[PDB]
Amino acid sequence: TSVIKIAVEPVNPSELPKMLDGLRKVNKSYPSLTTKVEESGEHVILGTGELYLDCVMHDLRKMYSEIDIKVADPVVTFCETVVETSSLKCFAETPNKKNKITMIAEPLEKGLAEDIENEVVQITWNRKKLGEFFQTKYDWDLLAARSIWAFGPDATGPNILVDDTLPSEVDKALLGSVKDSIVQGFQWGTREGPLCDELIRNVKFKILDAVVAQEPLHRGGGQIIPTARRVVYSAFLMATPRLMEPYYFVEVQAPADCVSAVYTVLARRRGHVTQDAPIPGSPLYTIKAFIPAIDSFGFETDLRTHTQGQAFSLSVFHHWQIVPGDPLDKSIVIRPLEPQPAPHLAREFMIKTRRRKGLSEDVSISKFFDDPM
Amino acid sequence: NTQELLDLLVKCENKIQTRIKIGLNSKMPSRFPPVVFYTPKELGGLGMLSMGHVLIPQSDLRWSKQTDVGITHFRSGMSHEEDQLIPNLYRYIQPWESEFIDSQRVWAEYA
Amino acid sequence: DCLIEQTHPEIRKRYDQDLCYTDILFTEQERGVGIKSTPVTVVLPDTKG
Amino acid sequence: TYQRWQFTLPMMSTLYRLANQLLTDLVDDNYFYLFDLKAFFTSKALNMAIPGGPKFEPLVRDINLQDEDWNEFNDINKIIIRQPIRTEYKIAFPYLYNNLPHHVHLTWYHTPNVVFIKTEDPDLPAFYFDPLINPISHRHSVKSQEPLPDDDEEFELPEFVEPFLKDTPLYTDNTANGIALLWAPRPFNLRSGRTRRALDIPLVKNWYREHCPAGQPVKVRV
Amino acid sequence: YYRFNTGPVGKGPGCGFWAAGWRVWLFFMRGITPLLERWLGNLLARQFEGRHSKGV
Amino acid sequence: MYNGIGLPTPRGSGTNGYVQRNLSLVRGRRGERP
RNA sequence: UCUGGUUUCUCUUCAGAUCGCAUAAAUCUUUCGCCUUUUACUAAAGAUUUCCGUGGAGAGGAACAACUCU
RNA sequence: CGCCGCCAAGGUAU
Ligand SMILES: O=P(O)(O)O[C@H]1[C@H](OP(=O)(O)O)[C@H](OP(=O)(O)O)[C@H](OP(=O)(O)O)[C@@H](OP(=O)(O)O)[C@H]1OP(=O)(O)O
Numbered sequence: 001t002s003v004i005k006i007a008v009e010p011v012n013p014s015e016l017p018k019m020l021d022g023l024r025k026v027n028k029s030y031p032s033l034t035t036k037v038e039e040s041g042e043h044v045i046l047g048t049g050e051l052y053l054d055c056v057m058h059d060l061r062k063m064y065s066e067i068d069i070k071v072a073d074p075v076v077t078f079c080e081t082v083v084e085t086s087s088l089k090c091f092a093e094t095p096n097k098k099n100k101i102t103m104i105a106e107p108l109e110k111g112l113a114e115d116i117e118n119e120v121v122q123i124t125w126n127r128k129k130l131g132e133f134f135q136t137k138y139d140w141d142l143l144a145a146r147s148i149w150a151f152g153p154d155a156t157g158p159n160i161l162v163d164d165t166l167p168s169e170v171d172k173a174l175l176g177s178v179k180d181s182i183v184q185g186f187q188w189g190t191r192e193g194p195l196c197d198e199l200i201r202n203v204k205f206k207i208l209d210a211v212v213a214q215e216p217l218h219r220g221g222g223q224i225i226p227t228a229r230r231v232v233y234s235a236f237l238m239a240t241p242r243l244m245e246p247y248y249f250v251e252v253q254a255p256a257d258c259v260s261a262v263y264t265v266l267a268r269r270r271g272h273v274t275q276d277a278p279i280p281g282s283p284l285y286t287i288k289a290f291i292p293a294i295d296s297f298g299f300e301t302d303l304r305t306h307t308q309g310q311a312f313s314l315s316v317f318h319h320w321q322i323v324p325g326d327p328l329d330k331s332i333v334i335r336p337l338e339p340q341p342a343p344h345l346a347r348e349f350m351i352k353t354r355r356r357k358g359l360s361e362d363v364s365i366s367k368f369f370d371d372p373m
Numbered sequence: 374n375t376q377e378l379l380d381l382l383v384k385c386e387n388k389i390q391t392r393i394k395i396g397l398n399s400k401m402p403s404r405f406p407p408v409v410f411y412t413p414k415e416l417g418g419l420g421m422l423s424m425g426h427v428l429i430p431q432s433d434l435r436w437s438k439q440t441d442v443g444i445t446h447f448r449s450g451m452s453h454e455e456d457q458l459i460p461n462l463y464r465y466i467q468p469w470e471s472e473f474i475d476s477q478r479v480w481a482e483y484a
Numbered sequence: 485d486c487l488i489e490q491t492h493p494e495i496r497k498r499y500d501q502d503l504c505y506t507d508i509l510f511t512e513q514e515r516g517v518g519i520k521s522t523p524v525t526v527v528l529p530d531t532k533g
Numbered sequence: 534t535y536q537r538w539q540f541t542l543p544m545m546s547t548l549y550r551l552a553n554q555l556l557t558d559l560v561d562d563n564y565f566y567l568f569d570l571k572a573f574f575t576s577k578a579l580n581m582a583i584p585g586g587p588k589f590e591p592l593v594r595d596i597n598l599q600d601e602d603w604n605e606f607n608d609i610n611k612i613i614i615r616q617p618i619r620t621e622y623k624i625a626f627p628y629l630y631n632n633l634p635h636h637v638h639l640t641w642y643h644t645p646n647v648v649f650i651k652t653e654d655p656d657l658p659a660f661y662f663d664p665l666i667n668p669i670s671h672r673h674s675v676k677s678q679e680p681l682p683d684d685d686e687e688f689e690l691p692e693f694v695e696p697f698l699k700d701t702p703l704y705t706d707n708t709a710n711g712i713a714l715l716w717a718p719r720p721f722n723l724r725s726g727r728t729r730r731a732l733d734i735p736l737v738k739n740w741y742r743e744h745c746p747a748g749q750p751v752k753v754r755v
Numbered sequence: 756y757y758r759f760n761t762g763p764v765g766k767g768p769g770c771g772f773w774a775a776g777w778r779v780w781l782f783f784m785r786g787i788t789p790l791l792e793r794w795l796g797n798l799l800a801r802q803f804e805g806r807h808s809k810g811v
Numbered sequence: 812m813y814n815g816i817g818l819p820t821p822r823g824s825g826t827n828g829y830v831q832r833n834l835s836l837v838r839g840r841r842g843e844r845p
Numbered sequence: 846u847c848u849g850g851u852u853u854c855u856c857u858u859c860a861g862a863u864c865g866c867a868u869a870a871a872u873c874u875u876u877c878g879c880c881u882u883u884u885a886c887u888a889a890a891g892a893u894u895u896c897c898g899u900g901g902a903g904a905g906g907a908a909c910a911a912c913u914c915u
Numbered sequence: 916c917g918c919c920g921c922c923a924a925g926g927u928a929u
C-alpha cells in the first residue's frame with residue numbers, strides 16, 4: 001500500500017498548468033503514484049517509499065516541469081477503527097421526516113480482515129457458500145451469515161454489513177433490506193473520511209432496525225443516502241473510535257561488532273524487535289523488527305550513520321496498528337512543537353490533520369451526529 | 374531580546390579590534406592579546422566595555438520566522454575561550470523596571 | 485550485460501567501473517539501484533543450438 | 534625510461550605486508566556514506582555541513598524569498614513532527630526533505646557489503662566467523678530423481694572417468710595471499726600497470742577522508 | 756604528527772614523514788615557475804634594454 | 812551542523828562558530844550515552 | 846621447407862579517456878569579507894589560458910640482433 | 916560544530 005503522502009506546491013502560483021502537466025507525466029511514468037486534489041486547493045501525492053519518491057521528485061523537477069517546487073514535511077496516510085462495541089444507538093432523520101434507521105457498530109478479527117483484504121472471499125460467489133465459509137470461520141449465527149450484501153471499499157475492505165441481528169422480517173415490501181441505495185451510499189461514503197478525512201477499516205456496521213417509505217418513487221428513495229451516511233458514521237464515532245498507524249517491517253543485515261546501534265535507533269523510535277537471526281555464510285546477520293512509519297523518516301540513512309557503514313536496512317508496509325491515544329479527548333492542551341513521547345499523541349495527530357484540509361474541530365456528538373432535543 | 378543587534382555588536386567590536394591591530398601592523402591574537410584592551414585608564418590602557426563575551430543566543434532557523442520557540446543552542450561570541458570570563462556591562466547597570474519600582478517607593482517614602 | 489556481451493562481439497568490458505549500461509537513467513547510474521528497466525530482445529542457442 | 538611494470542603475486546603480497554600502518558582495512562565504498570565527492574558537492578551547494586566534514590562558502594542562491602501569505606498557507610505549526618529533519622537527511626537526498634535544488638550531485642547507495650574474513654592460519658577453508666543452522670547428517674524433505682543405485686558401469690570411459698584435475702589441490706602456500714590481494718586497495722589489485730611520479734602518488738590520502746576518531750583535539754579535526 | 760603519538764611512542768620530536776609538504780611545495784613552484792619566469796624576463800627587459808615611458 | 816543551524820559566513824563576522832547546546836533545558840529524556 | 850624483432854635516443858601531428866585514481870597559479874567578468882588609495886588579498890560561481898607530466902603515431906639509427914614470436 | 920596569523924609606495928625634497 002502506497003502510504004507516504006507529501007503535499008506539493010509551485011513556488012510561483014502563476015505557472016500552475018505546467019506543473020500539472022509535469023505531474024501527469026510523472027503519474028504516467030510512475031504507476032504506484034497516486035495524486036489527489038482536495039477542497040483546500042493544494043495538490044498531494046502519495047507513493048510507496050523514500051527512494052521511489054526521491055526519483056519521482058527528481059524526474060518531476062528536472063525533466064518534466066522545470067520550475068522550482070516547494071514540498072511539505074512528510075506524513076503517512078493513516079486509518080480509523082473502533083476497538084470496543086457500541087454503547088449507544090443512533091437516530092435518523094430525512095427531509096421527508098419518514099425513515100428511522102437505528103444501527104450499531106462493532107470490531108472484527110484482524111486475520112480475516114487481512115483475508116478479505118487479500119481477495120480470499122469474492123462477490124461473484126454463491127450466497128450460501130460464502131455464508132457457510134463465514135459461518136464455519138467466525139462461528140456466527142446461521143440466519144445472519146447468509147443475509148449479508150456487498151462489501152466495503154471497492155467491495156474488498158473489511159467494512160462488512162450484517163442485517164439480521166434483530167429479527168429478519170420487519171417490512172420487506174419494496175426495498176426491505178440494503179440493496180441499491182444504502183449500498184451505493186456506503187460505496188460513496190467510505191473513502192471520504194468521517195472523523196478527520198481518513199478511511200475506516202476493521203469495523204462492521206449492523207442495522208438494528210429500519211423502515212422504508214410508502215412509495216420510494218414518490219417519497220425519499222434517493223433522499224436517504226446522506227441520511228444513511230450520517231447514521232453509519234454517527235454510530236461509528238459514538239463507540240469511542242481510535243486511529244490506526246502503519247508500521248514498516250524492517251530487515252537489517254549487520255555485523256556483530258556494531259549491533260547495539262540498530263537497537264538504540266529502534267528503541268528511541270518505538271521499535272518492537274522480533275527476530276535476531278544468525279544466518280549461515282556471511283558474519284553479518286539479520287534483525288527483523290517493526291517500526292512506526294512516522295518514525296521511518298531517514299531510517300536507513302541514520303542507521304548507516306550510527307553503524308559507520310556496516311549495517312543496512314529495508315522497510316516494507318505492514319498492516320495497521322492502534323495508536324497511543326484517542327481522537328475524542330477534550331480539555332487537553334497540545335504543544336505545537338516538542339513531539340510527544342506521551343500516550344496521548346493521537347489527539348495531536350488528529351488536530352494537526354484537521355488544521356490541514358480537514359474540517360472544523362469540536363467533534364463531540366452535539367451538532368452533526370445527534371440531536372439533543 | 375534583539376538577536377540581530379547582539380550579532381552587530383560582535384561584528385563591530387572585533388572590527389574595531391582589527392582596526393587597532395592594523396595600526397600596529399600585527400593582527401595577531403597571541404602577540405596582541407585582549408589584555409591590552411580590557412584595562413582601565415587609571416592603571417593604563419585604552420578602557421573598553423565588553424559585549425562580545427555574552428554568548429549570543431540562536432534558535433531553530435526553520436521555526437525562527439514561524440514561532441517563538443524559547444531558548445536553545447547557545448553560540449559563542451568572541452574567539453577568546455581560555456576561561457578569563459571578561460564581564461558584561463549590563464549586569465552592572467540597573468534595569469528599567471527595577472528603577473521605576475524603586476523610584477515609586479523612593480518618592481512615596483520621601484513625601 | 486553478460487548475455488548481451490555474449491551477443492555483441494563489440495565490447496567495452498569492465499576494467500575500472502562496472503558496465504551496467506542497462507540502468508540507463510542519470511538517477512540510476514549514480515545511485516546504482518535502478519529506477520526504470522529496459523527489456524532486451526536477443527537470441528540464445530541451446531545444447532542443440 | 535621506466536614506463537610499464539608487471540609483477541607477480543607473492544612479490545606484491547610482500548609489498549602489501551610492508552605497506553601497513555598507513556593503509557586502511559576498508560575494502561568497499563560503504564564507509565564513505567555522506568563522505569563521497571558528490572555528497573560533499575551537495576553539502577557545498579546546500580549551505581550545510583556534515584559533522585566532521587567541510588564548511589564551504591555559499592553560492593548565487595543565498596537569499597530565498599516567499600511572501601507572508603503563501604508560506605503562511607504552506608507552513609504554520611501544522612505538520613505532524615515526530616523527530617526533527619536533520620541535515621544528513623538532506624545530504625542523503627535533497628529532493629523531498631529540501632526544496633529548490635541547484636548545482637546538486639547525487640550519491641551512491643548500498644555497495645554489496647563485503648566482509649572479508651581475514652586469515653592468520655593455514656588450511657584456507659578455515660570455516661571461521663560462520664555459524665550453520667542446517668541439521669547435518671540427516672535431512673530429506675523433497676523428492677529426488679534416481680532413488681535407485683541400480684545402473685552398472687556402461688558409459689564412463691576409463692580413460693576420462695576421472696575429474697578434471699588431481700595433479701594439484703585447491704590450495705597451497707601462495708593462494709591465501711592472492712585472494713587477500715584480490716580485495717586489496719587500488720595500488721595493490723593490479724599485477725601490472727604504469728609508472729607514476731614521486732609528486733603524483735599521495736601518501737596521506739586515505740587518512741583524512743574518514744570519520745573523526747574520538748579522544749582527539751579540535752585542531753586536528755579542523 | 757598525531758599518528759606517531761598513538762601508543763607508547765613519545766611526545767618529543769622525530770616527526771620525519773616529509774613527503775606531504777614536499778608535494779604541495781612542488782605544486783607551488785609547478786605553477787609559479789612560468790609566473791615569476793615571466794616576471795624576471797620583464798625585469799631583464801626593464802634593466803638591459805631600458806623602460807618604455809610613453810609607449811604602451 | 813548537527814541538526815539544523817550553524818553559520819554560513821564565519822569570515823564576515825568577528826566570531827568563529829561552535830554553537831553549543833543549552834544545558835538549562837528541561838524535559839524527560841535527552842541522553843544517549845547512559 | 847618458406848614466413849623473421851624487444852629496448853634506447855631524435856621529428857610527427859592527432860588528443861576527448863578519472864588525457865594525470867592528484868591538482869598548481871594567473872587573467873577577465875561578477876558577487877562578497879577585511880579595506881583609505883593601490884599592488885600583496887579573502888573565497889564562491891561563470892570561461893579561458895599558461896605551466897609540471899602523460900596517451901597513439903609516420904621515419905632514421907644504435908643497443909646480443911640473430912635469441913627466435915610467427 | 917571552534918574565524919582570524921601583512922609586506923611595500925604614502926616624508927625628511929631634486
Ligand atoms: O602547539 P600545538 O597546537 O599543541 O601543536 C604543536 C606545534 O605545532 P603547530 O603549532 O603547528 O600546531 C609544534 O610546532 P611549533 O609551531 O610550536 O614549532 C609541534 O612541534 P614541531 O615543530 O616538532 O612540529 C608540536 O609541539 P611539540 O614540540 O610538543 O612536539 C605540536 O603538537 P603538541 O604540542 O601537542 O605536541
Ligand SMILES: [Mg+2]
Pocket residue numbers: none
Ligand atoms: Mg595618490
